[PDB]
Symmetry: D2
Subunit: 237 residues, 4 copies
């Protein structure tokens, strides 16, 4: 199976698979059953921002999800990620809908990785920043239902021509280049990511959520990973 580390913006509480009974953000290490979660009062119809960070010295993966003037939700988990993940990875965004639905719209996305040693210059770095998305994003690997729209937004899950969200959808976008996140000789490795998003929904209980994730380079949407599994996992183990 794939090897997954993710930060989930989980709009829909699936208490039968261990979610808290409220919308939440979470840190997922090789399981949909988050190792740490925080209560997230998600604001449908408003643009949110997520900031995710990690470095191999502190060994604390953290995320903050904010809406301007309203809320800042934070979650952290202590984990040696370079122990969990392979040395080379791809990074990506995923989203799903299931029986219930929402737009999973990404307006911008940036990422930086550094692999350092014995200099003020990091032996290796990758950075990308998208403040919008082109009609043919040749530097993204689009998986499942993911597409870019005429506004320059990345629609992870299916929307109709009027922008209405559809159920039973799954989509992912990976950055095209593999990222070298560890080498046995590294002194420190770090990564940071930010994205902005817009979740709209006509449903009283929108679903299912958005993730930022890191995986083996050849990662693909698992069979049966729809809805509550966020396009990341084949099961709820």
């Amino acid at each position: 199976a794939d090897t997954i580390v993710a930060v989930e913006l989980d709009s829909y509480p699936n208490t039968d698979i261990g979610d808290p009974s409220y919308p939440h953000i979470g840190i997922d290490i090789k399981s949909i059953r988050s190792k740490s979660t925080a209560r997230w009062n998600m604001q449908t119809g408003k643009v949110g921002t997520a900031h995710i960070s990690y470095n191999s010295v502190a060994k604390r993966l953290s995320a903050v999800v904010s809406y301007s003037g309203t809320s800042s939700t934070t979650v952290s988990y202590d984990v040696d990620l370079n122990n969990v993940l392979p040395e080379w990875v791809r990074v990506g965004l995923s989203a799903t809908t299931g029986l219930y639905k929402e737009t999973n719209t990404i307006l911008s996305w940036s990422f930086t990785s550094k692999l350092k040693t014995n200099s003020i210059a990091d032996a290796n770095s990758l950075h990308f920043s998208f403040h919008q998305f082109s009609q043919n994003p040749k530097d993204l690997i689009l998986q499942s239902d993911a597409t870019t729209d005429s506004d320059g937004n990345l629609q992870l899950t299916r929307v109709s021509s009027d922008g209405s969200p559809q159920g039973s959808s799954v989509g992912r976008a990976l950055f095209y280049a593999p990222v070298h996140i560890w080498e046995k000789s590294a002194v420190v490795a770090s990564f940071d990511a930010t994205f902005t998003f817009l979740i709209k929904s006509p449903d009283r209980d929108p679903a299912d959520g958005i993730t930022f994730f890191i995986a083996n380079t050849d990662t693909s949407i698992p069979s049966g990973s729809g809805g509550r599994l966020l396009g990341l996992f084949p099961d709820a183990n």
Copy 2:
């Protein structure tokens, strides 16, 4: 055919195809026959540095190639590159040997592209930096004879197990992700690249050289592009 823009570090004068009669650096726009050149006193056995820059406002592609304490060679050419190149490209390094030979060793390579509009943050950016190369560089597309060695260096052309250079070799390394260098709505696009290199040779007249190049995303080594054509062009037109 491919669409090529390159900066050539041309060690071997092929006067029959328009080279000056001395080792030189040059700006190549869709032809091996450089649009501008400068005399390059290349120092075999010494580590050199090349810095290349362009922005769409100034429209001047420039390169400087230096060896510490000895020489700084500069070449520039006025050209609207975003007119010449497609909107999406891959960036790369090439090298060849022919009847004569040299190591074409890359010790480090960095690149930054920016596509800007109406903000102090560039609507799009890609950056990578390699201060060494891994044994399996999953973020490089290696073409022809190019490989990485046990010292962490990128050997563009064939070297034996003792490091001796071989003739009749061609190799290229592309960064894995396509780069978005223009959009019709862009206010300014720019790129910068630096690499360090080591050319060693037992030959009295080493050959053939190293380039940094930008091309259509699906670029491949053309048939008949060995030696004097630097792995870039099918002919000397």
Copy 3:
């Protein structure tokens, strides 16, 4: 006297001191009488963006000033700036009003300088980015009338409590740290700057303009530099 290099966004044509007879952008090298200008259809009441760039290899100082959907104005000048300027400088924004007036409001400002040699890491770099300004910007040297307002904007010239611009005003903001733009041993030096601005005015012919400028570290507003001299020069020589 100070040593000044500037990019001027000159809203008011002072034809008696060599301005073209229309609002214009210009490159100023030690004189208010621009070495190169371009016609600028300035859009009062709209947020503009200016992007300025230079590197010591190309030796071409360029600027582009844009308003989204309307206009992109470009000006360039070939000059060896590291010949004109001292090795250490301060960088800044200036603005004036005179008999006629306008707001000279800066919404954001970023700057990067690099001094490079023989590595993919630039022997020296300074970068700052302000996407807003604090009520006490301790990393700015405010000169003359310059202040920050309750919206987080930098008002270079005097505005009343309702935001109405005042005549006979001059103001500048320098970044606090000196910038090392040249060393005799440098292989390449470069700088880039971006700012966004908002010029509003009740006057039929607004004045006087905004500049980005580079100067000796101890630069100060010259006596008699108001209005048409943009807070930069003691006279119109």
Copy 4:
């Protein structure tokens, strides 16, 4: 008194003021008596690298100090630094000698601060990088005995003309511009620093150490802060 947060590379065990009985690295929050320490096998005569990082979400200040091929020493401490420090600070390096001595030579130093909100672009950033130091470093505030030498190195403490270290010395270097590390409206603030150093000594027990520190902007060497107090504190409380 000043408000100090520091990472200490403490070469000399002062057990009478709470040091461990071995050379160590440590996290100092408003006291020389470190909140967390780690055993540091310091290699006199070898170039070391220190990497320091923090972000306001994780709230974990970490440092790693390494010598290539030999050792990597790590220390971390959970602390809300934006609670401890004022909103505006200066950042710096300090060093001392006392009865015993060592060179406190800085070969390079870089720093990045970010203050973020609701965008993939950080509402505020400052970065500097010095891969060497000029004879008149106009962007450093040199305090006490600190000077730059003819090799381009920053000698924090006094060395004779042959490079021999002197006792009873204290010196600091601050970056010239204040740094904005917090604002009440910030979603996340972070900083990172790296420096490389060379400690040489003829003494069997070299002293006293080097720090990277963050302080109120108007920070100065306290009276009585020599030797074991690392030029940071007026006493050992």
